Design a protein around this ligand. Structure first.
Ligand code: GOX
Ligand code: GOX
Ligand code: GOX
Ligand code: GOX
Lengths: 483, 483, 487, 487
C-alpha cells in the first residue's frame, strides 16, 4: 500500500460556470463567457461548440445530490468558486485614475463593504450560503476560490473586443477590473469567512491571458490576437491577485493562495535540459517570482512581495521541448498536442481530449515548486476526459501515487482534488469532454458512478492506495485501445 | 434499479486444472491435459501455447485468499470441480463387456465404494475437504461439479490417439471410461455430500467431443480429426452423464444437473429463422432431449430418460447462421469468430479472445431452455477475456441485466456465476487470456481487484444492479477502442 | 472501357503562390498571404503552420522539368495563374469615388494600358512569357486564371485588418481593389492573349470571402470574424469578376469564365431534400445567378444589375467531397463527420475512407455538381480541380479513376464538360497547412526539388494517353478498401 | 538510378495447382492437394478455407492473355511447373526394394522412357507444349520446375495418412515416390528440352516436409504431426532431388537447380548472433550441404554420400520476410510478432507494416539471404519468388521497388544473381488460405476471369522495360508509411 498522512484530504474541484447551470432558475446570462458561447459568429466559426451552459449538470439546484455522492465516496475536501456575475450582475458606480499602470493599493474598510452590500444580489448570496452550509455538513473541508474565468458583462464585453473595439468594458485589459476584483474578493471573504477553511484568489490566470489573447484557436474570450495585450492582461491579473490577497486579509486570518495551470516540461533529448529551464522560467517562475518575491518586468514591487500562503497545482500532462537557435520550442505529438483517443509520439495513450498519459510529470511539478518556494501545496486539479472510463482508473491511481512520491521526498502536499466529481461544461468544447468520476445524463441530470468512482472511494476511505488496487499504478494497456 | 429475488445468489465458477496448480506441492502430472500441453510436438505445432499449468494461480495452496476476496465481494455461491486424476491417479482393476455399445446400468453399492476407497488418494481427498470446508465457512452455497475436461492418464493417453493408435487408453471413445466415471461420481458424492448443496456431473461435454475430434485447430486432446469418433465420444459422454446421475442419487438426495456450452443462434437475415432452429436442434436440443426425454440416435432409452434436475447455462456470445441449399452455416466475423480487440461485422466490440459483445443472447438462451423443459437454471459461466478491464464492467452489468430480464419473463434462474473470480490457465491458449474479476500476478500469485470486481461487489452486496451503476447496461463505446 | 470525346483534354491545375517559390531568386515577399504566413502572432496562435512558401517546389525556376513530366504523362491542358503582386509590386497612382457601393464600369483603353505598362515589372512579365511559351510548346492548351488568392500588399495589409484597424489597405473590403483588379485583368490579357486559349478571372472567390471573414480557424487572411464584412467582400469580388470580364473582352475575343469551390450537398435522410436545395441556393446559385442573370441583393433589396448580367462564358468546377445537410426548425445545418469535416486518415460516419486532410471519399458528388450546373445554366464546364491529400498514394489511384469515371457519366447524361484538370501535377504549399498536405501526382523532395512519379501518375498517364479509363485499370473505379487503412 | 546488368531478367513465378484451373475442361481432380481441400472433415475443422481450386484464375485456358500482359509489362523470364498428376493420372507398373532406406541410383534409358511414354496423358502433354511454345514466342526465358507440391493421388492419399493409416500410398514417406519422381523428371526433360532454358527439380521441399508433418495448423497435407516422419520425408525429398538431377542430366545439358523457401534470420539483441547461425544451420545449410557437398545425417550418423554430392547448378531464392531469433539455454527460439508471425494488416513489434497475410516488411533480408548463399557455395541464383498479399495494392509498389533494390545491392557486392521473378503475375489459389490472399501484379475477377493491372504492375513495367529502378520511382525504395494504415 501507499498510505498518506492522517491529515491529507482527498476531494474534488469544480467551477461555477461549468457546473451550476442546468436546473430551471439557475441561468446566469450576465458574463462575458455566457455571451461568448451564445454568439452567432463564434458558433459559425466553430470557435465555440454550440453547446450552452444553461443545459448543464445543474449543481445550482442539485447540490445536495452532488454532496451526498461525494460523502459516500469518502471525500473530505472541496474547492469551488462563487461567480462574481451572480453577486454583482449590475454595474458598480465608478470609484481612482484609470490611466495609471500600477494598482499598489485598494482601500477597503467596513463602510465600503456595507456600501457594496447594497448592490449585491441577496438571492444569489443566500443560495451560495445554502450550498456551502450543506457542503460543510458533510465534513468537507472548504477551499473557496474567488474567480474561475467568467467576468461580469459590465466589466467585459468580449465581442466588442474581438472586433477590435477597445472603447467598452475591456476585462483584464483595464485596471478598473483589478480594482473591482480586489473589492469583490474582500466582500466575499467578509460574507463567507465563517464557512471557509482556505481561500484561492484565482484559477489559472495564465490560461485566461494565454488563450484569451494568443491561443485564439481555442475559442476563449475575447479571442483578440495580441502579444502586447496578453502581456497587459497578465500584468493586471498579477496585481489583481496581490490586491485581492490584501483585501481578503483585511477581513480574515485564513490562508490565501492561488491556483495555476501547470505542465511538466520535459527534454526531447539529453541536450535539451537548458530548454526545459527556459520553459519553466517563461511559463511558471516569472509569475510566482512576481507574487512571492515581488520580482517583475526588472524591479521589485513591495506591494507584490509575499502575497501568497499556498500554491494550488493543477496538472494534466507534460510538454516536450527542444533547444532552438533563438531559444526553445514545444513539440506537437506529446502532452496536450496529440490526436484524440490514440497514442503520442512516445507510444503513451491519449485521452478523449488528445492529452498524453504522463503521471511522472506531477512529481516533477510538485517537487520543483517545493524546492523553489517551500510553500505548501494542494493538487487542485488532475483528471482526464474519458466518457467510457477506460483510462481513468489508471490515470487516478498513477497520479495519486506520484503525490505520495512527492510527499515521500519531503514536499508539503496537503490534499488531492480530482477534476472533477461529475461531468461538466468544458468551455469552448462543450459537453462532449467528460471529466467526471460521475457520469451525467444531461437529459435528466442523473449522476452515475463510473468504476473509477468506486476506485476513488477505495483510496479516499482508506487514506491510501490499497494493496488490492495497486496494479492501477501503471499505463493503460495500449494494444486494446485505438491507435 | 434491477432487483433480484431474495433467494438469488451471485458468485463464480472455476475449474481444477485451470486454477489449482501454481503453489509448490500442487502439481498433478497425471492427466491427459497435463501430458497434452507438455508435449514437444504439440508445442512445436503451436497447438498449445507453451505455457504450463504448474505455473498457475495456485488455488491449491492459496484457497483461503481466494475465499476471503469472494466473501469481501459479497458472493454467495461457488461452483468448482474435483480433479478425478488427483483422487485416482493409478489404474483401477478392470471390472463388464467393453464391446457392448450401451451402458444402461452401473451397479454401485456400499461394499463397492469401500473397495474403491482403498485405491483413493487420501491426501488429495483430505485437501479438498479442507478447501470445501473453508468455502462453506464463508457462507458460500456449493455446487460441486465432477468433471471439467482432464481425464486420468490411465483412462486416456491423448498423444497415442493423436497419432492414430487406438490400442491404448482411449478416453471418451471407451465404455471403460463411462463405467469408471459413474463410479467416481458416486464415490465423490459419498465422500462429500455433507458439504455439497447441488451437483453437476460434467462441464460442457459438447466442447470435449467437439474440439477433441472436429475443431482440431483448437489444440484440445486428443486432436484426432473424425466425425465418426466425435459422435462416438458424444454418445459415451451422454451415457456417462446418465450413469453418474444414478450413481450420485444412490448415495444422495441433492439436486443433480449438468453444465453445457451455449451460443445464442441468430439469423443473418429475416429469411434465416429456419436455419436458427436447425442450429439449435443440432447444438442443443439433441443433447438435452437425450438426457431429459431419453430421445437418441431414433429410439427412447428408459435408462436415459429423466436424468436431470437442473441446467447449467454457460454463455459468452452469439453465433450468426444463414440458410443454405444443403442446410445451414455459421458466419465468420460474428460471435466467437472475430478478430481480437476489434469490432465484429456488426460493429460490436470484441474481447481479447475475439468474442463479440452480445448480452441479448443470454436472454435468448435462458428463455428457450425454460420454455422447452421447465427445469430451473443457474448461469454457471459468463465472462470476458479482458486483462485491461476496459469492457468487463459493461459486459458484467449487461449480462446480469439479461438474467433479470429472463426471470421477469417467468424463467426460474437461481443464480449467476461469473467466469471467473481470478485469472487462470486458459487451456491451449495459456495464461494470456485473462477472465478474472481479480488480476493474477503469476510471479507472486498476488490477486488484485480490477474495477469490475468493485462493480460486482456493488451488485452482489445489494442483490441488484443499483441505480448508480445502471449506465453500464450498455455496449462499451467502440470509438476509443481498437478497430 | 470508358472513352472520352476526341476533343476532351486531361491536364492539371496549379497556383502561383503555392508552386512558384523555392528556387534562388523566385521569392515574392509582396502579398498579403506572404505577410500572413510569416506573421509571428499567427505562427504562435497556430493559425498558420510555420512552413514558408519560399521553401516550395520551385516552379519559377524549374518549370521546364514540370512541363517535361506533364508531357510524358500525356497531359494536354493546364490552368495556372499570374501573381498580381509580381507584376505590380508597388502601388499604382490613385485613379473614382471610393464611397460608392457599386462599380458598374471601369474604362480601360489603349492609352491607359500603355500607362499601366510603365509600372509593370518587366522581369516578371518576361519570365511568365518564358514559362507560358514553354508550356504551349508541349502541346498544352492554356487556361490563364488572373487571381488565386494573394493580393499585393499595397492593396491589403491583412495584419492591420486582423487587428480590427480598417484605415489601411483593406483588400476585398475596398472598391479600390475592384477597380484595380479590372485594370490588372485587362492588362494581363492585353500582354498575353497570343499565348492564352481561355481565361478565368478568379479561383474560388467564395473561399476568399468565407474563410477570410467567417471560418477564421482556417487561418486565411485577414481572419477578421464578421458576417457583415464577409457579405461586403463577396459583393465586391462579384463586381470585380464582372468588371474583369468586360476588361478582358475589351482586349480579347477568347472565352472568359470563373472557377468556383464546390461541394455536393447530400441529404442526411429522405426528409432532407429541401435542406439540400436551400444549401445549394446559399452556397452556389446565389453567386452564379448574380454573374449570369444579374440577380443580386444590395443592402436589403433584390435587384437586377445590367452591368452584372451575362458576364460568363464557362464554369470551372472545383470539387473534392460532399457536404451532408439536415433540415432544421430555422433552416438547415451541415453535419460533422462527413465531407471535409472528418478525422484525418480515418473513416467518415458513413464508413467511407478519409484523406490526409480528413476529407471523405465521395466521387458521386462530382456527377451531382456537373449535371446540376448544366441543367441550370447550360454553360460548358471544365473540372478545374479534383484531387486528394495523400503522400503515401494509397487512395489516389482509386480517387482519380473514380472521379474521372463520374465525368464520363456526366457527359453521357448530356453535360458539356471539356476537360478534367487534377489538383495537382506536383505537391505544393497548402496555404495555412503548409507542405504536409501532398496533392501531387508527383511527389516533391523539398530538399532537392526533385519530382517523383507516384503510381497514380502512371495510372493518370494510362488515362490521358488513351483518352479513356482503359479496361485494365477499370477496377480502380471503386472505394479504396477500408479494412487495411487506419480507422 | 539503379541499373541492372544487360543480361539480368525480370519476370514472374507461378504454380500449376494455384493458377491452371478455372476454365471449362481444366479440372485436375487427381492430386493429394485436390482431395485435401475438398475433404469434408478438413473443411469443418477450418484446416482448409472451403475455397476450391477449380474456381481459379484459369491459366489452362487463358494462358495467351496471361502472356500478352507479361509481354506488355516487359517481362523476359518465367518459372512455371508441369503438374505430375496431369501427365500420369493413373499408376505406373511397380518397377526395386521399398525396404531400402537409400536410393543411390535410378536407371533410366531411352527404352524405359519410351515405355513411360505409353502411360502419359497425351492431351495434357500437348496442351503444356502449346502453353510453353506461346510463352517462348513472347521472348520469355523459361525455367521449368518439375514439382510445386501436389502429388498424384496414386502416390499419396493424404486423408488416410492424416488418420494415422500408413498402409496406403504415403507420398514423401515412401521411396517409391522418390523412384517415380526421378523417372518423371527425366521424362519431362526428354519431352520438353527444346523449350526449356533452365530446370528446377522442385519448389520449397522444406515447406512440404515442415508444414506437412510439423506445422499442422497450416492445413497442409497430410497434416500428420511427427518430428520423426518429417525427418523421413525430408530425407526422401533430398534423395529425390539428387535422382531427379541425374535423371534430367541423362537427357539434357541444361542447368538444373532447386528452389527453396527462405527467411532472413535476424538477432533480437546483439547477444543473439550465435542464435542466428544455429537457425541458419538448421533451416538452410543442412539441406544445401546435403545436395552440394553430400553431407547428411542417416538415422543417427553424419556421412558423405557420393550419390548426393554436387547435384546442383543453381539456387532459386524464394524470400518474403525475416525471422527474429533469440538465444535460449537449450538453443534458440523464433519470436512471434515479427516476420511471418504478425497480425494481418497491422504493424510488427518493430513498427514495420504487415501484409494481408500478417508478414512483416523487411526487404533488407533479401540482401542477407543472397549474399550468404553466394559466400557459402558460389553458385549463381535467381530470386524465384518475392511478393506480397495485398488486394488493395497499398504496400506492393514499395515492396516491389525495395526488394528489387536489394537485389541490385547484392549484385553490387559481387553475388551472381541473374533474375528477379515476382510472385506472382496474377492472383491465384493460396493453398489452405484459398483465394482471399492476393499476390498478383494483376488482380483477378474470379467471376469473369478478367485480369486488371494494379498500379504496382505499371511500376513493374517501368522497372522491366528500363532494366532499372528509374530515377522517377526511386522514392518507392522505402517503407510504406504506417500512419495511414491499420494498426
Ligand atoms: O480541461 C479540464 C479542466 N482543466 C482546467 N485547467 O487545465 C480548468 O481549470 C477547468 O475549468 C477545466 O474544466
Ligand atoms: O473460455 C473461458 C471459459 N469458458 C469455458 N467454456 O466456454 C470453459 O468452461 C472454461 O473452462 C473456460 O476457461
Ligand atoms: O486544398 C487543395 C486545393 N483546393 C482548392 N480548393 O478547394 C484551392 O483552389 C487550391 O489552392 C488548394 O490547394
Ligand atoms: O505464399 C505465397 C507463395 N509463397 C511460396 N513460398 O513462400 C510458395 O512457393 C507459393 O506457392 C505461395 O503461393
Amino acid at each position: 500500500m501507499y498510505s498518506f498522512p492522517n491529515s491529507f484530504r482527498f476531494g474534488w474541484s469544480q467551477a461555477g460556470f461549468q457546473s451550476e447551470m442546468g436546473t430551471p432558475g439557475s441561468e446566469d446570462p450576465n458574463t462575458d463567457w455566457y455571451k461568448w458561447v451564445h454568439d452567432p459568429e463564434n458558433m459559425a466559426a466553430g470557435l465555440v461548440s454550440g453547446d450552452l451552459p444553461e443545459n448543464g449538470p445543474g449543481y445550482w439546484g442539485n447540490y445536495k445530490t452532488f454532496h451526498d455522492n461525494a460523502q459516500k465516496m469518502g471525500l473530505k475536501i472541496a474547492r469551488l468558486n462563487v461567480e462574481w456575475s451572480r453577486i454583482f450582475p449590475n454595474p458598480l458606480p465608478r470609484p481612482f485614475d484609470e490611466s495609471k499602470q500600477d494598482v499598489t493599493e485598494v482601500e477597503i474598510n467596513e463602510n465600503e463593504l456595507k456600501r457594496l452590500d447594497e448592490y449585491a444580489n441577496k438571492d444569489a448570496l443566500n443560495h451560495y450560503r445554502e450550498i456551502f452550509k450543506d457542503l460543510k455538513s458533510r465534513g468537507l473541508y472548504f477551499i473557496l476560490n474567488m474567480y474561475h474565468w467568467p467576468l461580469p458583462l459590465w466589466l467585459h464585453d468580449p465581442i466588442r473586443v474581438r472586433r477590435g473595439d477597445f472603447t467598452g468594458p475591456s476585462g483584464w485589459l483595464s485596471t478598473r477590473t483589478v480594482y473591482e476584483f480586489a473589492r469583490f474578493s474582500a466582500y466575499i471573504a467578509w460574507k463567507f469567512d465563517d464557512l471557509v477553511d482556505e481561500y484561492s484568489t484565482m484559477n489559472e490566470p495564465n490560461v485566461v491571458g494565454g488563450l484569451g489573447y494568443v491561443g485564439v484557436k481555442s475559442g476563449f474570450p475575447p479571442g483578440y490576437l495580441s502579444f502586447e495585450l496578453s502581456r497587459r492582461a497578465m500584468y493586471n491579473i498579477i496585481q489583481a491577485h496581490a490586491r485581492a490577497y490584501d483585501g481578503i486579509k483585511s477581513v480574515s486570518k485564513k490562508p490565501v493562495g492561488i491556483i495555476y495551470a501547470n505542465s511538466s516540461f520535459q527534454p526531447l533529448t539529453d541536450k535539451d535540459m537548458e530548454a526545459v529551464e527556459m520553459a519553466e522560467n517563461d511559463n511558471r517562475w516569472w509569475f510566482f517570482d512576481a507574487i512571492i518575491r515581488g520580482e517583475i518586468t526588472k524591479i521589485v514591487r513591495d506591494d507584490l512581495k509575499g502575497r501568497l500562503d499556498w500554491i494550488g497545482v493543477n496538472y494534466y500532462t507534460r510538454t516536450v521541448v527542444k533547444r532552438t537557435e533563438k531559444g526553445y520550442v514545444s513539440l506537437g505529438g506529446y502532452g496536450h498536442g496529440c490526436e484524440r483517443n490514440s497514442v503520442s509520439l512516445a507510444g503513451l495513450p491519449t485521452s478523449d481530449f488528445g492529452w498524453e498519459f504522463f503521471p511522472e510529470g506531477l512529481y516533477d511539478v510538485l517537487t520543483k515548486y517545493w524546492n523553489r518556494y517551500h510553500l505548501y501545496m494542494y493538487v487542485t486539479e488532475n483528471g482526464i476526459a474519458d466518457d467510457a472510463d477506460y483510462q481513468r482508473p489508471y490515470y487516478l491511481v498513477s497520479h495519486v501515487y506520484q503525490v505520495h512520491r512527492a510527499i515521500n521526498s519531503g514536499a508539503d502536499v496537503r490534499g488531492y482534488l480530482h477534476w472533477s466529481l461529475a461531468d461538466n461544461y468544458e468551455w469552448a468544447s462543450g459537453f462532449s469532454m467528460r471529466f467526471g468520476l460521475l457520469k451525467v445524463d444531461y437529459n435528466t441530470k442523473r449522476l452515475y458512478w463510473r468504476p473509477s468512482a468506486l476506485v476513488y472511494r477505495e483510496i479516499a476511505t482508506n487514506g491510501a492506495i490499497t494493496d488490492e488496487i495497486e496494479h492501477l499504478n501503471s499505463v493503460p494497456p495500449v494494444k486494446p485501445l485505438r491507435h
